[PDB]
Write a protein that holds these residues in place. Sequence first.
Motif, PDB file in Angstrom:
ATOM      1  N   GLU A   1      41.886  37.087  44.647  1.00 19.17           N
ATOM      2  CA  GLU A   1      42.635  37.532  43.248  1.00 19.17           C
ATOM      3  C   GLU A   1      44.096  37.725  43.426  1.00 19.17           C
ATOM      4  O   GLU A   1      44.578  37.983  42.435  1.00 19.17           O
ATOM      5  CB  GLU A   1      41.955  38.611  42.707  1.00 19.17           C
ATOM      6  CG  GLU A   1      40.421  38.703  42.597  1.00 19.17           C
ATOM      7  CD  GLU A   1      39.724  37.827  41.616  1.00 19.17           C
ATOM      8  OE1 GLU A   1      40.254  37.350  41.182  1.00 19.17           O
ATOM      9  OE2 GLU A   1      38.193  38.602  41.368  1.00 19.17           O
TER      10      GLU A   1
ATOM     11  N   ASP B   1      47.969  34.810  43.908  1.00 21.04           N
ATOM     12  CA  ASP B   1      48.984  34.414  43.094  1.00 21.04           C
ATOM     13  C   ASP B   1      50.014  35.507  43.122  1.00 21.04           C
ATOM     14  O   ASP B   1      51.108  35.329  42.390  1.00 21.04           O
ATOM     15  CB  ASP B   1      48.224  34.485  41.527  1.00 21.04           C
ATOM     16  CG  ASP B   1      47.678  35.750  41.190  1.00 21.04           C
ATOM     17  OD1 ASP B   1      48.327  36.919  40.615  1.00 21.04           O
ATOM     18  OD2 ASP B   1      46.444  35.695  41.222  1.00 21.04           O
ATOM     19  N   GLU B   2      50.121  36.443  43.897  1.00 19.14           N
ATOM     20  CA  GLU B   2      51.164  37.506  44.073  1.00 19.14           C
ATOM     21  C   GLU B   2      52.281  37.088  45.435  1.00 19.14           C
ATOM     22  O   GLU B   2      53.465  37.599  45.621  1.00 19.14           O
ATOM     23  CB  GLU B   2      50.865  38.917  43.994  1.00 19.14           C
ATOM     24  CG  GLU B   2      49.887  39.244  42.957  1.00 19.14           C
ATOM     25  CD  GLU B   2      49.004  40.571  43.208  1.00 19.14           C
ATOM     26  OE1 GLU B   2      49.472  41.463  44.089  1.00 19.14           O
ATOM     27  OE2 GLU B   2      48.129  40.786  42.501  1.00 19.14           O
TER      28      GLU B   2
HETATM   29 CA   LIG Z   1      46.053  38.287  40.702  1.00 23.43          CA
END
Ligand SMILES: [Ca+2]
Length: 242
Positions: free
Chosen positions: A169, A172-173
């Motif tokens: 998760e 995406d950073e």
């Molecule tokens: Ca994220």
Amino acid sequence: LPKPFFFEEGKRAVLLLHGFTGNSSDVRQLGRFLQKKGYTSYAPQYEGHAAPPDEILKSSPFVWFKDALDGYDYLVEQGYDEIVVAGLSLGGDFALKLSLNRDVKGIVTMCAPMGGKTEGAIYEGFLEYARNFKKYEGKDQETIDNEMDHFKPTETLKELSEALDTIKEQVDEVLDPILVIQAENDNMIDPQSANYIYDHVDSDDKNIKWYSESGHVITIDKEKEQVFEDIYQFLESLDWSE
Ligand SMILES: [Ca+2]
Ligand SMILES: [Ca+2]
Ligand SMILES: [Ca+2]
Ligand SMILES: [Ca+2]
């Protein structure tokens, strides 16, 4: 039994992270190749590793991440501002996460999985890790079965499953330049993970390479010199201050 290594050359440095139940010898040849090109490199070992497998069961993947952060801080203590992080299998997941916690010049993930699917491939491997080790210990064949029926991996393998989902998760950073390396015929992870990474990082500078004849431990397989050279190509394309 293996131990960490530190090859001091120039001012550009690389931090090398190994995989689950691996050790520094999995990345040593890559360390020697970088040294010959003039890159400094440092390879720590996680807690419980290069040790009897029971030590891993007493540990946690969350310790293992701190062993990686301590690796980076060690390089900076020794005089090295400018650091690329390169990680193998699980270490490739840690490299992604580390880039969110320290200033790196670039990331290299090598056969890093996406998804905490620990059943099947990851499970038998921890078992075989203890088999060949209990054999290394010089234990008769009747014995190896005894402490094996007392091997409870469900605990450790389940913290590993949560940790991986958390990092998935977080992909995406990621913002720093990245090179994604993946072996085509991988029996250990799902090789589609490499596409998940390459497509979902927010990097402005990215690259993915596929190797058609290697296994999962790609840094020691038959195509390793090709893999070393592509890593070098990547390193030389970054914006080192010197
Ligand atoms: Ca994220
Ligand atoms: Ca020193
Ligand atoms: Ca964008
Ligand atoms: Ca590039």
